[PDB]
Amino acid sequence: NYGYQPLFEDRRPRNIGDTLTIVLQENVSASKSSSANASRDGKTSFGFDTVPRYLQGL
Amino acid sequence: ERIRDLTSVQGVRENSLIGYGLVVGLDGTGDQTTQTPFTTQT
Numbered sequence A: 001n002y003g004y005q006p007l008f009e010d011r012r013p014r015n016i017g018d019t020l021t022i023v024l025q026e027n028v029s030a031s032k033s034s035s036a037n038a039s040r041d042g043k044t045s046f047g048f049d050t051v052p053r054y055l056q057g058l
Numbered sequence B: 001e002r003i004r005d006l007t008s009v010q011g012v013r014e015n016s017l018i019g020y021g022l023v024v025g026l027d028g029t030g031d032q033t034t035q036t037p038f039t040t041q042t
């Protein structure tokens, strides 16, 4: 090979045949949450158990 | 006054070149490699 080569550079790959080292160190994490609620409660009462003579009509 | 002393030609122009290098010798007095990591790396 007659190609020029720098002395002080970091010897990065530059041509087709050059080799490079890859450190994967891949780490991905995704999360998703959702919630919903709805509560309705009702309860009504009414009773005499004793009615006046004048109110017995109703 | 000559034309050359007060005029420049369109095609004639200078350019700036920059580069990084190392200097050896110096009888000491060189970079402190502890505080200059790029020197040792180069």
Ligand SMILES: CCCCCCCCCCCCCCCC(=O)O[C@H](CCCCCCCCCCC)CC(=O)N[C@H]1[C@@H](OP(=O)(O)O)O[C@H](CO[C@@H]2O[C@H](CO)[C@@H](OP(=O)(O)O)[C@H](OC(=O)C[C@@H](CCCCCCCCCCC)OC(=O)CCCCCCCCCCCCC)[C@H]2NC(=O)C[C@@H](CCCCCCCCCCC)OC(=O)CCCCCCCCCCC)[C@@H](O)[C@@H]1OC(=O)C[C@H](O)CCCCCCCCCCC
Pocket: A054, A055, A056, A057, A058
């Ligand atoms: C937002 C506000 C808007 C305004 C709203 C207006 C009022 C909106 C309306 C509210 C009133 C509800 C109407 C109920 C009667 C009715 O029409 O709808 C019925 C179906 C229900 C639909 C209602 C959906 C509304 C939908 C909701 C709408 C809401 C908006 C059909 C029906 O008719 N079903 C019917 C049938 O059943 P069956 O199907 O099986 O056959 O027959 C059986 C057997 O009949 C009984 O027999 C008895 C003997 O056996 C006999 O006694 P006896 O003496 O003879 O012995 C006895 O006679 C008697 O009461 C004898 C005598 C009693 C006098 C005692 C003193 C009481 C004073 C009491 C004074 C009241 C004080 C407020 O009378 C009356 O003078 C009644 C008083 C009149 C007051 C007038 C108000 C002046 C304003 C005074 C104002 C005061 C100012 C401070 C016989 N009673 C009857 O006939 C029935 C009827 C005879 C009508 C002739 C009298 C003149 C009416 C003249 C005109 C009336 C017109 C309305 O009386 C009533 O209650 C009428 C009540 C009217 C109140 C309105 C208030 C207006 C405010 C005005 C406001 C604007 C009944 O049981 C059954 O009725 C029952 O069960 C009813 C039960 O009792 C009573 C439960 C009440 C609980 C509250 C409701 C709770 C319900 C809630 C859930 C929905």
